[PDB]
Design a protein around this ligand. Structure first.
Ligand code: CLA
Ligand code: CLA
Ligand code: CLA
Ligand code: CLA
Ligand code: CLA
Ligand code: CLA
Ligand code: CLA
Ligand code: CLA
Ligand SMILES: CCCCCCCCCCCCCCCC(=O)OC[C@H](COP(=O)(O)OC[C@@H](O)CO)OC(=O)CCCCCCCCCCCCCCC
Ligand SMILES: CC1=C(/C=C/C(C)=C\C=C\C(C)=C\C=C\C=C(C)\C=C\C=C(C)\C=C\C2=C(C)CCCC2(C)C)C(C)(C)CCC1
Ligand code: SF4
Ligand code: SF4
Lengths: 143, 52, 80, 165, 41, 731, 35, 64, 94
């Protein structure tokens, strides 16, 4: 079994001068994501919102408007720095949902113990014709 | 805002060159106040229909 | 809220999973291909619809099919 | 008179147009000395214009309401009235020459398709082979009819890709 | 000169030379046989 | 949040795309949530009632505005020297010169001069007074209210018809041909004979006295004894004057053909005879199919029997009855195709055979009517092909269409598309090459080097009609021929007088420029058909996207993979073909307008030696006829043509605003909107208010549609302004 | 043209009054949340 | 026993939804483990994505 | 926030970390003086309800129509003034 890591709120943030591409009004009333990673030295990386930031030694904490920004930062950390990280979904009511490394290992590597949903056992051309599903509220591929 | 909107209509309206520009501009500004008023009406009715 | 489906022509090359920028796809164990792995889409609510997975699929025709459907604040990719 | 048209040999407006062109060129003439290079150029232009108008009147072209040659594009209507050179004879000429070019290109395609690298032979053209096939394409109609009667000109539909309807 | 002739056999050089010789042939045809409206034999 | 109640998927969209697609998917009832086929067809039937009520209200409004603010009384007395008045103008933006410039046809204030031809039509059908027009408007108001009540009534479950009633094809065709087509035509014959024929001869017939006036002095007895020739005794003479009893007659069903010498229009007795024959034939046609009386046809079995042997058509028409009957999109495509072709026929016939009294003297009315019907026909034909593509996407079943002609034509669709491509390529190559060669030889000072191919085939068919201008002496152009002798006491004298006269539009004299522009029209039709047919046949799938039928009729793309998949849906093919339709109808109407501008000035030569090369088209037509248009308003003042100048510039603006959505695509705009959302979300004194719906860029399909709409609107407004200004300001 | 006053009332009605009321009504209805 | 066409033979694709439908392809390998598409077919003609090989089943491939 | 160093996230204080701030809004009871506040709340008393503030727009539209009825002509305006002869046209028309 695998347990998700807790979001340690009192985690230091990278050195940054302040951008205009950061959080907006969506964070207060819908959602804002957050990414946490461990860096082995003080070095400069690129923000998903524009500009350069310096992440510090040890834990680094960065909140972002969208999950795609968090994954862009994570993939640039993994490629240009060989640094893994954790992404969390933080609701404004207080509940925090763990996100990307959901079962510990990365999704491109098998784990034996995942849900194989949305996997049809037919070919592309074996879907139903749209006339046979007429007036149903579903596309032919989700039958 | 009502004291703001008088001036453009006074100096620039279609009847700017006749003596009775002031009364017609007051009427125009009353109409403008009414339409901005119903803008506020519609906004407050659509954005405050519940609670959050 | 985009419909992403995986089909049995998948060869388990994991390229669709690597191409995904919002972590929608993952590899689950399978027995229908040589690599013994097939793609799956458990997090289609995070799918924006960019079809980068389709651009990475080498199977002809592609096995990871994305059907654009209902739009939400995450499918539209909005930061505001 | 094939469709209410008069021959340009006897139509008055053809002669009027020729006279107007020659008079405009003479108005251009009346500014230089007699033996200057512009004078010789304008004299050559005048000679070309008069030769063109006299040739058009000679060849038997049809003029409409005014003096402009009209062409007939109906076999029979142009054959029995002697205007097959308007459309029919150039139709045969284009069909022959376009078939020559197309058959040469086709035979080049089928010659380089059965080589080691057909991809390279289409940007790097084998010039002797192209020259030989361009020469051989002058007998394109007989070759094409022979390959059509043999059945080797067209491809079976079962060996050609289609979409899944 | 094998590589030079291969360069001369490349598609742009051959198409430019071919359209050049075809255009020149047509131009000299119109130079010696101008104003040929019809194929009068 | 719950505005698109027909689509809960759209209602959950927290952006402006929710309302944008809610407006545009409102009439796609098949895609609505919880929609059965019964409720579908009942909604269709009630919306049909709403549309009929709307049409009846629109024509009642035309009648009321002509009766109330028009000059119908003054136009009846002087049809050739009075400008028809559409409606009065009440615009508080008018300056005093605008008020003077728009006071024209003897009215009190500013009015619009009608170009719709309602004056000529109403004068021809026997309407003489404003009281009659008001009575017609009131009657149409009442009947539109009745149709609205019927639409409400049939939505009520006590009066909702069954789905099988909707699909009862044999009965619906029987009643439509016999009653909707036949009985209506017979009643129009009754109106023409009872009212229009006496009102054409100065004898007033109304509801107060039509029961005491005799349409023919030998009443009904010649009809019932078979002596029907007594209804064609004395026709109206060539010296007859409309609306007067001078040289009139008693015959109600003449058959002379040609045109009335004074009105330059068809004889009304000819129309009554035509409508009576049409009524008889359509009632007979409506007695064809089987209902409940044990006689008639089962059209399914007729389709079953239409299978030639040797497998020439495969299974023939196996199951096409169910294919048409089950698919509303197939029926809509057939209906739109036929209706668009009929609209083209109406355009091509009313200019050349003017039906209404004192038509073809009003040059603006004829041109406006022709161009209107041509544009309507082109739009409707594009809709027919689009709905055919929808039927392939939605309602096409390969199982029940297995071996029949639909499956056959889908099997070899590559041959059809490739041959349409070849025909379009040939037409474009040759027409453009001839035009550019003519331009070059015109520029070099040598008009004699033009390639002027004589349209000998169309001239030959003109000669087969009796046009003795090309010297063929073929069929009707030779009096000795059997068709000429067969009807020489029938329609031949009037038709020959019409065909041999250069004062009308009955088959105009054609030349090489007509040949070139006809090939331009052929290229336009061929390429538009190529785009539409390719979109229909590739709607279910292609090699680039084999599973296109699963994605629906309209969708943006398939992403940048596989080299790029921009504009891959059948909707995008319709979208591309609308431009080609607009270009084709532009060529058609440019040709018509320039030819008739040459005719009406008496200068057929301007078109004859200026249409063969494109500089003549640009200079002698576009540049020359726009001089009075662009001087509608100027620093020296303004006149009545100012409205068409403003509409000219308006259409140019809308066209380029369309180009905005056409060229720029969704991505620059989304970033810009995000930046402006950042600006507003943290601008002081404006953070008090916020958007209920998140501002987003228009979707790819939506903005394609918006750019196409602006393109079409600017196209139509610009050409309507130019045509009406260049004809009304000149005539 | 009889009843000349009637356009002077109807044109502002269908140009200002009815359009403003219709636009306000539709703006209210598109964001009614719970219809 | 080996299943499917022999290695290196000439085969025609019967999958109507594939790029190389009814075209010329060469068998590179056939898997005997029980793969749903064990036949590996290489084509001289590439598709839109740029690949020249694809995996097919048993009934959608005939030899020669 | 708990931003005593570089910690800008806190689940126990999630209000400040998200970015919800007043920017310039400040709480203060003192602003308007006496009697005039009562004067203005009496001026805008019953009108605060949505139906009556709708009725104000209704009487505004009534004024819009009253301009067209009697008000456009009181400021002259060319659309209701008189006319001065007419023009014939291109040919013999009117
Ligand atoms: C491209 C299509 C085409 C068209 C539209 C025409 C049209 C025409 N041809 Mg023609 N023809 C064609 C192809 C065509 N042809 C071809 C390919 C050939 C070569 C075999 C001929 C050889 C030909 C001859 C020898 C004659 C015509 C003639 C005619 C004219 C009279 C036909 C007639 O009497 O009634 C219709 C005939 C039916 C059978 C129906 C007519 C305008 C006659 C003519 O010159 O007119 C005076 C004439 O004698 N044609
Ligand atoms: C010699 C090569 C060749 C041949 C034999 C053909 C033959 C054909 N083409 Mg094609 N085509 C070619 C080249 C060729 N094409 C090229 C290079 C292009 C890209 C511009 C096209 C683009 C094209 C389109 C878009 C279409 C055709 C179509 C057609 C068919 C209709 C007839 C036609 O002439 O259409 C017209 C052909 C053209 C407009 C292109 C001609 C270009 C030049 C003149 C040909 C190339 C010359 C070649 C380099 C000579 C090599 C000599 C050799 C010794 C090295 C026909 C079977 C049509 C079709 O599908 O019909 C059903 C059609 O829609 N062609
Ligand atoms: C497809 C459209 C088209 C057609 C059918 C023609 C046809 C013709 N043009 Mg024209 N032209 C066109 C397009 C076209 N042109 C365009 C687009 C332009 C603008 C660049 C011009 C500009 C132009 C000029 C300036 C002139 C012509 C001339 C001519 C005539 C000369 C015939 C000739 O060259 O002798 C016969 C040619 C041969 C026997 C050679 C055929 C064999 C060759 C070697 C094969 C070539 C292989 C490829 C001829 C009737 C000339 C003329 O005098 O008009 C009467 C002339 O002065 N054209
Ligand atoms: C004799 C009985 C009868 C009659 C008179 C009608 C009449 C009508 N039916 Mg109905 N129907 C019938 C029986 C009948 N039906 C039966 C038995 C069934 C059950 C099987 C149905 C089922 C049915 C359905 C489901 C629907 C109709 C609809 C309609 C309306 C068609 C739309 C329209 O008005 O366009 C008018 C058509 C014409 C005027 C024909 C003109 C021909 C061409 C297009 C024009 C050319 C004429 C001429 C040149 C134009 C000159 C005029 C110009 C001067 C202005 C129409 C009034 C539709 C509708 O609108 O719903 C209310 C529809 O949805 N019917
Ligand atoms: C009898 C005629 C008829 C009927 C009943 C239908 C019915 C239908 N059509 Mg169709 N269509 C028609 C004719 C018709 N069409 C014609 C003539 C065309 C060619 C223009 C089209 C082209 C077409 C397309 C491409 C599509 C449909 C679609 C549909 C379906 C949904 C309609 C919709 O999208 O919601 C409502 C439609 C609208 C609200 C129209 C939008 C408003 C237009 C574009 C703007 C008009 C602006 C105006 C002119 C500005 C005035 C100018 C002035 C200010 C200067 C529906 C079943 C859609 C479909 O099947 O879904 C898959 C589809 O995509 N139609
Ligand atoms: C004539 C067609 C046309 C028009 C009107 C516009 C208009 C506009 N473009 Mg645009 N564009 C066009 C063609 C056009 N473009 C084309 C063909 C392309 C493709 C290359 C582009 C590509 C493009 C880009 C990339 C951008 C724009 C941008 C803009 C906006 C700039 C803001 C501005 O100008 O302030 C004022 C607005 C106007 C002058 C438009 C006319 C408004 C009139 C004059 C006044 C309004 C009164 C109104 C009619 C009264 C209401 C009546 C009521 C009944 C509705 C503007 C609305 C830029 C933008 O987004 O904003 C900065 C932007 O970056 N355009
Ligand atoms: C659809 C037909 C139609 C159209 C396009 C018009 C258009 C016009 N009318 Mg008119 N009207 C119509 C029918 C129509 N009318 C009918 C049948 C009557 C008889 C009762 C009248 C009686 C009438 C009068 C007395 C006056 C006008 C006037 C006007 C002009 C200004 C609008 C206005 O202020 O009056 C408002 C119009 C009405 C109160 C009645 C119109 C009701 C129509 C039938 C609605 C149709 C809507 C359509 C089917 C669907 C569109 C959707 C819509 C509901 C949002 C304008 C050009 C004024 C004028 O003359 O300007 C100088 C004027 O004073 N009309
Ligand atoms: C479609 C209907 C319509 C109608 C009926 C009008 C009518 C009018 N417009 Mg308007 N306009 C319209 C559409 C319309 N517009 C559109 C779509 C646009 C955008 C393109 C404009 C843009 C526009 C501008 C820029 C201006 C006008 C102006 C005017 C007024 C002309 C001057 C005047 O009469 O003195 C004065 C008008 C009045 C005295 C009547 C209004 C106030 C009355 C008394 C009632 C107020 C009630 C209140 C309680 C007191 C007039 C009432 C001019 C104006 O005067 O500004 C207001 C002017 O500047 N219009
Ligand atoms: C085919 C039979 C047609 C012959 C009708 C003879 C009419 C008069 C004879 C006549 O008009 O003069 C001869 C005529 C063409 O000569 P022209 O009239 O053009 O000669 C005058 C000018 O060319 C010289 O200035 O030849 C033809 O009849 C058609 C040519 C045969 C077409 C060859 C194509 C073969 C395939
Ligand atoms: C897409 C699609 C569709 C549609 C299609 C279309 C659109 C079609 C069309 C078309 C058209 C639009 C056509 C037209 C036509 C017509 C015709 C084809 C005719 C005829 C006939 C004849 C043969 C005639 C003759 C004559 C003459 C010439 C004149 C005089 C008289 C007589 C009789 C002699 C559908 C839905 C179906 C299906 C699906 C797909
Ligand atoms: S469309 Fe984009 S976000 Fe959705 S699964 Fe494919 S790669 Fe991931
Ligand atoms: S890219 Fe295609 S073949 Fe590779 S794992 Fe993803 S779905 Fe399977």
């Amino acid at each position: 079994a695998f347990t998700p890591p807790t979001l340690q709120s009192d985690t230091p943030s990278p050195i940054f001068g302040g951008s205009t591409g950061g959080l907006l009004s969506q964070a207060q009333v819908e959602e804002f994501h957050v990414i946490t990673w461990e860096s082995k030295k003080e070095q400069i990386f690129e923000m998903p919102t524009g500009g350069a930031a310096i992440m510090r030694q040890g834990p680094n904490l960065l909140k972002l408007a969208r999950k795609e920004q968090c994954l862009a930062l994570l993939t640039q950390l993994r490629t240009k720095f060989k640094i893994d990280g954790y992404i969390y979904r933080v609701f404004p009511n207080g509940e925090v949902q763990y996100l990307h490394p959901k079962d510990g290992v990365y999704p491109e590597k098998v784990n034996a113990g995942r849900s194989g949903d949305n996997t049809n056992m037919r070919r592309i051309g074996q879907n139903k014709e749209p006339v046979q599903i007429k007036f149903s509220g579903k596309i032919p591929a989700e039958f | 805002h009502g004291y703001l909107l008088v001036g453009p209509f006074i100096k620039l309206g279609p009847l700017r060159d006749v003596e009775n520009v002031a009364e017609i501009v007051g009427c125009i500004n009353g109409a403008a106040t009414v339409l901005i008023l119903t803008l506020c009406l519609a906004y407050g009715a659509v954005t405050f229909q519940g609670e959050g | 809220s985009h419909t992403v489906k995986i089909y049995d022509t998948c060869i388990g090359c994991t390229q669709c999973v690597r191409a995904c920028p919002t972590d929608v796809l993952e590899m689950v164990p399978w027995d229908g291909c040589k690599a013994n792995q097939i793609a799956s889409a458990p997090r289609t609510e995070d799918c924006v619809g960019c079809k980068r997975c389709e651009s990475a699929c080498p199977t002809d025709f592609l096995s990871v099919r994305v059907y654009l459907g209902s739009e939400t604040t995450r499918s539209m990719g909005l930061a505001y | 008179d094939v469709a209410g048209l008069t021959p340009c040999s006897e139509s008055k407006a053809f002669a009027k147009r020729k006279k107007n062109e020659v008079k405009a060129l003479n108005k251009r003439l009346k500014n230089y000395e007699a033996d200057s290079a512009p004078a010789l150029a304008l004299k050559a232009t005048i000679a070309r214009t008069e030769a063109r108008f006299d040739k058009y009147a000679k060849q038997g072209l049809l003029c409409g309401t005014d003096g402009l040659p009209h062409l007939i594009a109906d076999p029979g209507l142009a054959l029995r009235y002697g205007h097959a050179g308007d459309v029919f004879i150039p139709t045969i000429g284009f069909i022959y020459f376009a078939g020559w070019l197309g058959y040469a290109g086709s035979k080049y395609l089928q010659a380089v398709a059965a080589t080691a690298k057909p991809i390279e032979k289409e940007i790097i053209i084998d010039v002797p082979l192209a020259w030989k096939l361009l020469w051989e394409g002058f007998g394109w109609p007989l070759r094409a009819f022979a390959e059509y009667k043999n059945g080797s000109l067209m491809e079976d539909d079962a060996k050609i890709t289609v979409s899944p309807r | 000169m094998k590589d030079f002739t291969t360069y001369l056999s490349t598609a742009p050089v051959l198409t430019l030379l071919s359209v050049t010789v075809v255009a020149g042939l047509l131009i000299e045809i119109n130079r010696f046989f101008p104003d040929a409206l019809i194929a009068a034999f | 949040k719950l505005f698109p109640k027909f689509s809960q998927a759209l209602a959950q969209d927290p952006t402006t795309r929710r309302i944008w697609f809610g407006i545009a998917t409102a009439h796609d009832f098949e895609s609505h949530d919880g929609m059965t086929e019964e409720r579908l067809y009942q909604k269709i039937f009630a919306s049909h009632f709403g549309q009929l009520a709307i049409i009846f209200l629109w024509t009642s409004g035309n009648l009321f505005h002509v009766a109330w603010q028009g000059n119908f009384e003054q136009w009846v007395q002087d049809p050739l020297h009075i400008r028809p008045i559409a409606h009065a103008i009440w615009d508080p933006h008018f300056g005093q010169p605008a008020v003077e410039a728009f006071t024209r046809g003897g009215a009190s204030g500013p009015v619009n001069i009608s170009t719709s031809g309602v004056y000529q039509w109403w004068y021809t059908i026997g309407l003489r007074t404003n009281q009659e027009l008001y009575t017609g408007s009131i009657f149409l108001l009442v009947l539109a209210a009745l149709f609205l009540f019927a639409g409400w009534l049939h939505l009520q479950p006590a009066f909702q018809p069954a789905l099988s009633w909707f699909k009862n094809a044999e009965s619906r065709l029987n009643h439509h041909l016999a009653g909707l087509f036949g009985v209506s035509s017979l009643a129009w014959t009754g109106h023409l004979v009872h009212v229009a024929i006496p009102e054409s001869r100065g004898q007033h017939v109304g509801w107060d006295n039509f029961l005491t006036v005799l349409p023919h002095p030998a009443g009904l007895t010649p009809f019932f004894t078979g002596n029907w020739a007594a209804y064609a005794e004395n026709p109206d003479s060539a010296s007859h004057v409309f609306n007067t009893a001078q040289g009139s007659g008693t015959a109600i069903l003449t058959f002379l053909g040609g045109f009335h010498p004074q009105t330059q229009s068809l004889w009304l007795t000819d129309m009554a005879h035509h409508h009576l024959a049409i009524a008889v034939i359509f009632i007979l046609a409506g007695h064809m199919y089987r209902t409940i009386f044990g006689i008639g046809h089962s059209m399914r079995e007729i389709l079953e029997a239409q299978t030639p042997p040797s497998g020439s058509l495969g299974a023939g028409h196996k199951g096409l009855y169910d294919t048409v009957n089950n698919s509303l999109h197939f029926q809509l495509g057939l209906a739109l195709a036929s209706v668009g072709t009929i609209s083209s026929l109406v355009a091509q016939h009313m200019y050349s055979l003017p039906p209404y009294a004192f038509l073809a003297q009003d040059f603006t009315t004829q041109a406006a009517l022709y161009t209107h019907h041509q544009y309507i026909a082109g739009f409707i034909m594009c809709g027919a092909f689009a709905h055919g593509a929808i039927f392939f996407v939605r309602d096409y079943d390969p199982a029940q269409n297995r071996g029949n002609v639909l499956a056959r034509i889908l099997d070899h669709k590559e041959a059809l598309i490739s041959h349409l491509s070849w025909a379009s390529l040939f037409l474009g190559f040759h027409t453009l090459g001839l035009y550019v060669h003519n331009d070059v030889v015109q520029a070099f000072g040598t008009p004699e080097k033009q390639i002027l191919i004589e349209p000998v085939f169309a001239q030959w068919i003109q000669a087969a009609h009796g046009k003795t201008a090309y010297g063929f002496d073929f069929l009707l152009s030779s009096a000795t021929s059997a068709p000429s002798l067969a009807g020489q006491a029938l329609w031949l004298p009037g038709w020959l007088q019409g065909i041999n006269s250069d004062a009308n539009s009955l088959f105009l004299t054609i030349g090489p420029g007509d040949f070139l522009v006809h090939h331009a029209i052929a290229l336009g039709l061929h390429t538009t058909t190529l785009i539409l047919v390719k979109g229909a046949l590739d709607a279910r799938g292609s090699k680039l996207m084999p599973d296109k039928k699963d994605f629906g009729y309209s969708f943006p793309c398939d992403g940048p993979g596989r080299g790029g998949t921009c504009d891959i849906s059948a909707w995008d093919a319709f979208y591309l073909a609308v431009f080609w339709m607009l270009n084709t109808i532009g060529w058609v109407t440019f040709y018509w307008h320039w030819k008739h501008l040459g005719i009406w000035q008496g200068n057929v030569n301007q078109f004859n030696e200026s249409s063969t090369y494109l500089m003549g088209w640009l200079r002698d037509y576009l540049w020359l006829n726009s001089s009075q248009l662009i001087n509608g308003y100027n620093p020296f003042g303004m006149n009545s043509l100012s409205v068409w100048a403003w509409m000219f510039l308006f259409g140019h603006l809308i066209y380029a605003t369309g180009f905005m959505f056409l060229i720029s695509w969704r991505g620059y705009w989304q970033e810009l909107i995000e930046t402006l959302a950042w600006a507003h979300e943290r601008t002081p004194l404006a953070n008090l208010v916020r958007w209920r719906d998140k501002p987003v860029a228009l979707s790819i399909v939506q903005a394609r549609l918006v750019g196409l709409t602006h393109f079409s609107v600017g196209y139509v407004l610009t050409y309507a302004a130019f045509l009406i200004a260049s004809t009304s300001g000149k005539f | 043209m009889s009843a000349q006053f009637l356009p002077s009332i109807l044109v502002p009605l269908v140009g200002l009054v009815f359009p403003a009321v219709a636009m306000a009504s539709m703006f209210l209805y598109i964001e009614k949340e719970e219809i | 026993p080996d299943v499917g066409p022999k290695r290196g033979t000439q085969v025609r694709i019967l999958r109507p939804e594939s790029y190389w439908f009814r075209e010329t392809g060469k068998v590179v390998s056939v898997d005997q483990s029980g793969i749903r598409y064990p036949v590996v077919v290489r084509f001289e003609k590439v598709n839109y994505a740029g690949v020249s090989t694809n995996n097919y089943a048993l009934d959608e491939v005939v030899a020669a | 926030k708990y931003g005593e160093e570089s910690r800008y996230f806190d689940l126990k204080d999630l209000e400040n970390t998200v970015g919800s701030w007043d920017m310039y809004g400040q709480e203060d009871k003192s602003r308007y003086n006496g009697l005039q506040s009562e004067f203005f709340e009496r001026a805008a008393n019953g009108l605060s309800r949505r139906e009556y503030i709708l009725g104000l727009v209704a009487i505004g539209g009534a004024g819009i129509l009253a301009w067209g009825g009697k008000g456009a002509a009181d400021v002259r305006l060319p659309t209701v003034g008189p006319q001065q002869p007419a023009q014939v046209g291109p040919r013999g028309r009117l």
